[PDB]
Curated annotation (Swiss-Prot):
Residues 44-67 are annotated as: Lipoprotein lipase cofactor. Residues 32-40 are annotated as: Lipid binding. The chain holds residues 35 to 101 of 101 of the full protein. The lineage of its organism: Eukaryota, Metazoa, Chordata, Craniata, Vertebrata. This is Apolipoprotein C-II.
Length: 67
């Protein structure tokens, strides 16, 4: 790749900020899951892995009909 690389690059720079900000939030603080538990579901077939991106897609595109 190349184009997509630049994206994940600039985003990665801030990704960590979103990571440490997520963990302290409710990603690991007290989610009551954490991979070991957040994998059986989001791995059956990307139930929550790729759906996290399809969740909102079915909100704006269903609430405003635009996505």
């Amino acid at each position: 790749t190349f184009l997509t690389q630049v994206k994940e690059s600039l985003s990665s720079y801030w990704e960590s900020a979103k990571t440490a900000a997520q963990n302290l939030y409710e990603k690991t603080y007290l989610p009551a899951v954490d991979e070991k538990l957040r994998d059986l579901y989001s791995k059956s077939t990307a139930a929550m892995s790729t759906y996290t991106g399809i969740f909102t897609d079915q909100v704006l595109s269903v609430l405003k009909g635009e996505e």
